[PDB]
């Protein structure tokens, strides 16, 4: 249930496990636990040693070079809460250079209230990616897990699936397991942080992590807010005071701690705001009899004597040592070599300080974006100055944009000069505003504030260029802007025009194709755009190019980003036009929209025309042998630019020298219209007719069609059943001299055309004789004519051949010629 046993204030273990035995009798640690520097150990020295009593750690847990420890699943099988009241370099769980360890095994760790987890330099550590840190840490982006076995090698990660829940981390679901036999326990989304039981029921409202019986304050293993007599209470009832932000104690305990600190070598505790805190804030003072800090009758701040008068702030734990300070009797050096924004915690710890007796220095702070976390910074006395007599040193800040909000923030610097260098996103305007507001205007000398390094990567020209005439065409956009001239008009070397297609409105500032425009002659400068893709929205803005002057302000002029969209035109030809015949009167045509819509494709056009059969085939004697009828770069380095600057400056220098020397100051076809379809069914089609399909993608219908050439494809229907079959009875004639002349009605409506006829006559008992009848032969002889037949009874069968192929035979016809 709740916490039994001692409290064991945070301890450190070194060089052996002999002193590690003092963790047996306590379940909660009121401090930090460090196991580190353990070289003469073997893996058999940890199996027999276990600490199931440990439940929660207030400050942090640090493991550093403990040889022989392979998994923490034996050492801490009941660790569930790390409050993180005091961190270790903004980290609450650090595992560094922990050789001979394979898996964490902390399968009961559920919530880490404050801080992050850093795991680094563990060549044998696995089962790292199989942990859902988002269920434990509020901010998972602040973690740092690099240089392990997971990325150096491909060690196996066997999470039991036949049970380990799976949750998507980036775009795929992966099972979660602490070890090869322990799945990471996941609570339902309804249980935010109160924890869930074995069957998946939310615990008590003021519970956290795990519980024995749901909805029971006295059956929880970790109170979310406060602990008191085995029960979690939202606030400590009287006469119990909040102590260490995790438990409530009576007046006797706080008084005993105060007396023990007073009568010995310390954290001399006091009482304020129903709490037993180490020291009451500014404006309060503890009394003799009782420990409560009553408000003082005067402005007495809480001065914080900084050792050596120069304190470097590089972490949350280093900043936390100034918590509650209002006047600093030393100097501050803000140096966060990070990559993640610490402003949230830094403003909570710092920002309550009013005056700084020394200098304030911000050096190589990569992650800082503003100095606004100094909420109540007013006075910088600067009684102790940086080398070179400086009272404010900003250097090499990669992302410092604004120093303060000068609308409502006041600042005062008594002594010392200023310094600014290599702040690519801090502009000179902010520095000069600080000069004016602080009161150190006439105190800086040359090169104390650089010009080529401050704001050289930020566009802060603080002067507006206004476009005057923009006109749009098919692929050309004409731009015109009002002319601009610096006081020395020869400084203007031209304009730079930045253009980029913008699918949506929200576009950044500062791709981005550049074109240089020469300055005008003294007619708006303007520029015309070439080679644009129709029906596209582009982002246009102009930034001036002016010569640097080392003495005064560099110069400034630029235009706000405007959005222009080129108009529409004719679209492209549809791609992949394929026609398939599924019936003798139906063909299906399939296509895709063109790759260049040039607007919204509104409809399609399909045109039909029949291909007349070739007259060549009608006039051939196919009975002849050989009757095989077909079965139908960037600017050249810097030298370039420099050279142009140098030439322009040389011309200006010669002009100035000449003016100095000279002047002396004396004293139709079927069609249809598709509507938002990519396929169409065709009906009313003649069998075996070459159909030439003209397909268009057209995006304008009523105000005249504006659309390009068409795609062409041919299709032919399937053969019919009895189109080639010969109809009509066969008529035969026998002349005086036994001449056989046949008459048969042709298939008047055939599959295109009939190429030949075949007559097969066989006498009863004899063999079958064949004869080919050609088109010209049929036209001339009106059927089949045979010469010199032996007397007897024959059987006449006729077939017709067309472009489809072989036609069905006719019914047998019998004729008998006289034997004379």
């Amino acid at each position: 249930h709740l916490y039994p046993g001692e409290v064991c204030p945070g301890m450190d273990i070194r060089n052996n496990l002999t002193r590690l035995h003092e963790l047996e009798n306590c379940s909660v640690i009121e401090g930090h636990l460090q196991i580190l520097l353990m070289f003469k150990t073997r893996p058999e020295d940890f199996r027999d040693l276990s600490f199931p009593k440990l439940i929660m750690i207030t400050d942090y847990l640090l493991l550093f070079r403990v040889y022989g420890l392979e998994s923490l699943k034996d050492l801490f099988p009941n660790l569930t809460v790390i409050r993180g009241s005091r961190l270790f370099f903004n980290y609450a769980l650090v595992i560094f250079e922990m050789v001979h360890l394979k898996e964490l095994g902390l399968y009961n760790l559920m919530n880490i209230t404050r801080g992050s987890v850093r795991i680094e330099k563990n060549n044998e550590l696995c089962y790292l990616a199989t942990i859902d840190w988002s269920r434990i840490l509020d901010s998972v982006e602040d973690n740092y897990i690099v240089l392990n076995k997971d990325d150096n090698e491909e060690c196996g990660d066997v999470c039991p699936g036949t049970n380990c829940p799976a949750t998507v981390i980036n775009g795929q679901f992966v099972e979660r397991c602490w070890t090869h036999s322990h799945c990471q326990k996941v609570c339902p989304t309804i249980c935010k942080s109160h924890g869930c039981t074995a069957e998946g029921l939310c615990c008590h409202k003021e519970c956290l992590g795990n519980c024995s019986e749901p909805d029971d304050p006295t059956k929880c293993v970790a109170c979310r807010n406060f602990y008191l007599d085995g029960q979690c209470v939202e606030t400590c009832p009287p006469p119990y005071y909040h102590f260490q932000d995790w438990r409530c104690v009576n007046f006797s305990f706080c008084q005993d701690l105060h007396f023990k600190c007073r009568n010995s070598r310390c954290h001399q505790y006091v009482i304020h705001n129903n709490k037993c805190i180490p020291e009451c804030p500014s404006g309060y003072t503890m009394n003799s009899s009782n420990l409560m800090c009553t408000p003082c009758l005067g402005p007495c701040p809480k001065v914080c004597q900084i050792l050596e008068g120069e304190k470097t702030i590089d972490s949350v734990t280093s900043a936390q040592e100034l918590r509650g300070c209002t006047v600093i009797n030393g100097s501050l050096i803000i140096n966060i070599r990070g990559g993640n924004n610490l402003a949230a915690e830094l403003e909570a710890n710092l920002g309550l300080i009013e005056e700084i007796s020394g200098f304030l220095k911000i050096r190589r702070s990569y992650a800082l974006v503003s100095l606004s976390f100094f909420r109540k910074l007013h006075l910088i006395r600067g009684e102790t100055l940086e080398i070179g007599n400086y009272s404010f040193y900003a250097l090499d800040n990669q992302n410092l944009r604004q120093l303060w909000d000068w609308s409502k923030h006041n600042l005062t610097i008594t002594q010392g000069k200023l310094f600014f260098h290599y702040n690519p996103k801090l502009c000179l305007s902010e520095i000069h505003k600080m000069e004016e507001v602080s009161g150190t205007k006439g105190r800086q000398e040359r090169n104390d504030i650089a010009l080529k390094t401050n704001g050289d990567q930020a566009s802060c020209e603080n002067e507006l260029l206004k476009f005057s005439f923009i006109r749009t065409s098919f692929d050309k956009i004409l731009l015109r802007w009002e002319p601009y001239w610096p006081p020395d008009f020869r400084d203007l070397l031209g304009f730079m025009l930045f253009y980029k297609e913008a699918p949506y409105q929200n576009v950044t500032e500062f791709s981005w194709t550049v074109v240089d425009i020469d300055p005008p002659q003294r007619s708006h400068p303007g520029w015309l755009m070439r080679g644009l893709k129709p029906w596209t929205q582009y982002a246009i803005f102009v930034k001036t190019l002016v010569t640097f002057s080392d003495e005064r302000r560099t110069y400034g002029a630029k235009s706000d980003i405007i959005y222009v969209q080129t108009d529409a035109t004719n679209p492209s030809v549809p791609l992949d036009p394929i026609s398939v015949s599924n019936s003798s009167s139906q063909i299906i045509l399939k296509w895709k929209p063109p790759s260049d819509p040039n607007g919204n494709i509104t409809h399609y056009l399909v045109y039909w025309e029949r291909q007349a059969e070739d007259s060549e085939l009608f006039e051939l004697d196919y009975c002849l042998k050989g009757l095989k009828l077909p079965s139908r770069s960037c600017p050249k380095t810097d030298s370039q630019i420099l050279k142009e600057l140098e030439e322009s400056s040389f011309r200006k220098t010669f002009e100035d020298y000449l003016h100095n020397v000279v002047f002396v100051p004396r004293p139709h076809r079927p069609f249809e219209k598709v509507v938002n379809k990519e396929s169409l069914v065709i009906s009313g089609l003649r069998h075996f007719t070459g159909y030439r399909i003209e397909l268009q993608a057209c995006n304008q219908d009523s105000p005249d069609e504006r659309c390009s050439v068409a795609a062409y494809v041919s299709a032919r229907t399937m053969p019919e059943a009895k189109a080639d079959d010969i109809v009509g009875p066969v008529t035969h004639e026998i002349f005086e001299n036994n001449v056989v002349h046949l008459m048969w009605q042709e298939p008047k409506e055939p599959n295109g055309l009939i190429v030949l006829y075949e007559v097969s006559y066989r006498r009863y008992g004899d063999e079958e004789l064949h004869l080919c009848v050609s088109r010209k032969h049929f036209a001339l002889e009106r059927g089949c004519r045979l010469r010199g037949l032996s007397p007897g009874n024959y059987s006449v069968r006729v077939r017709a051949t067309s472009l489809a192929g072989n036609g069905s035979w006719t019914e047998p016809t019998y004729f008998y010629v006289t034997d004379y």
Binding site: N15, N16, E97
Partner: peptide, 27 residues
């Protein structure tokens, strides 16, 4: 042997220098 000790090399140098007595930490 006198040279710059940085990173893990510092830990190794201390471990060869001492470790039979053990590292020190304030009580």
């Amino acid at each position: 042997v006198n040279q710059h000790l940085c990173g893990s090399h510092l830990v190794e140098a201390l471990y060869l220098v001492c470790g039979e007595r053990g590292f020190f930490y304030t009580p």
